[PDB]
Amino acid sequence: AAQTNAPWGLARISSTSPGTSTYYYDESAGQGSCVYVIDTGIEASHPEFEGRAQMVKTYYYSSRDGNGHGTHCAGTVGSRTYGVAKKTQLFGVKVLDDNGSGQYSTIIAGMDFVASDKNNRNCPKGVVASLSLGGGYSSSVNSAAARLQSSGVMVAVAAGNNNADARNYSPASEPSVCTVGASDRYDRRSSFSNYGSVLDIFGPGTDILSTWIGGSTRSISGTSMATPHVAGLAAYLMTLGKTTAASACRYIADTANKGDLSNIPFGTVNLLAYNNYQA
């Protein structure tokens, strides 16, 4: 399949080179996979989700995404137009309030929730969790992300937007999950992207067009935007049977575009998520 005039990030993950416009992807499109978007919620009624999104848990008064961030991330995972895995099932877990903030205890509870809830869902091709959030280092947050990964979920987490070593941020610093840095359309590390040895992979994160609340769309930037590219890619690859939740991060790193990025500090991987699609 080929989506013409795709958002640059989708084109980028299906190209060895920057600057293309078509997103090439296998038509399976993550069908049969599930991605939990642990964030401010998902506006599941957005037409771009095609009924494939649903809220499954909120830690606030409403399950509504009153912010947009979660909806945006979910759209990069799996919306029709803006998504990597256009046929995946999206499950929203609202751990962040409508200002985009959440207490670590709530974020931890949301991860534990996904680890259990997935056992109630039909996800024959596997389960991914996309965590476009983070704060300062917390062993308990890291442990929750590790538990979620151990439970059989492909956990992708944002490296953070501090232009600093992700070692000091969580869940970015949890080694066992897939810690995602951000790149821009010119294959530069995004100016805000964290870096460091704990990063596993980069994905498109600067000027990412996706869904927004109110049935809208907008372009925003962050490692929060790169993370769902990787989560979606994992779902897509898991549906193709190329990898499993436990190995998807390594598989994505092994199959990434290598050395394409600039402004990567020594000791940080120079790996950009790539679907290796061949028509």
What residues make contact with Ca ion under the rule CB under 5 A? 16-17, 200, 257, 260
Q: How far is the CB of 97 from Ca ion (least distance, A)?
A: 28
127 is in an annotated binding site: no
Least spacing, CB of residue 171 vs Ca ion, in Å: 10
Identity of the residue, 165 or 260, whose beta carbon is nearer to Ca ion in the bound complex: 260
Q: Which regions of the chain does DSSP assign to beta strands (E)? A: 2-3, 23-24, 33-39, 53-58, 89-94, 126-131, 135-136, 153-158, 169-170, 178-183, 201-204, 208-212, 216-220, 257-258, 271-272
Active site residue 221: no
Tell the smallest beta-carbon distance from residue 260 to Ca ion (Å). Answer: 4
Do the beta carbons of residue 55 and residue 92 sit within 8 Å?
Answer: yes
| Beta strands 126-131; 135-136: pairing state | unpaired
Residue with Cβ nearer Ca ion (43 or 187)? 187
User: Taking the CB of residue 175, how many other CB atoms lie within 10 A of it?
Assistant: 12
The residue annotated as part of the active site, out of 79, 193, 224, 229, is 224
200 is in an annotated binding site: yes
Q: Is 22 helix (H, G, I), strand (E, B) or coil?
A: coil
**Residue 175, marked binder:** yes
Report the alpha-carbon distance of residue 204 to residue 227 in Å, rounded.
Answer: 8
DSSP 188: B
- H or E element at residue 78: helix 69-78
As measured in angstroms, the least distance from the Cβ of 220 to Ca ion is 25
Nearer to Ca ion, 161 or 257 (CB): 257
Round to whole Å and give the CA distance between 177 and 145: 7
User: Annotation-wise, does 26 bind a ligand?
Assistant: no
With respect to Ca ion, which residue has the nearer C-beta, 90 or 141? 141
User: Cβ closer to Ca ion: 92 or 181?
Assistant: 181
Distance CA 160, CA 133 (A): 8
CB of 222 to Ca ion, least distance (A): 19
The response to whether 117 counts as a known ligand-binding position is: no
How far is the C-alpha of 238 from the C-alpha of 166, rounded, in Å?
Answer: 27
Min. distance of Cβ 196 from Ca ion in angstroms?
Answer: 11
Q: Which of 46, 69, 72, 229 is catalytic?
A: 69
224 is annotated as an active-site residue: yes
184 is catalytic: no
CB 273 within 8 A of CB 13: yes
- Measured from the CB atom, the residue of 16 and 21 that comes closer to Ca ion is 16
d(CA 145, CA 173): 10
Which among 119, 81, 102, 120 is positioned nearest to 38, based on CA atoms? 102
Identify any residues that bridge with 183 across adjacent strands, giving them in sequence order: 189, 204
- Active-site residue list: 39, 69, 224
Per the annotation, binding residues for Ca(2+) are: 16, 175, 177, 200, 260
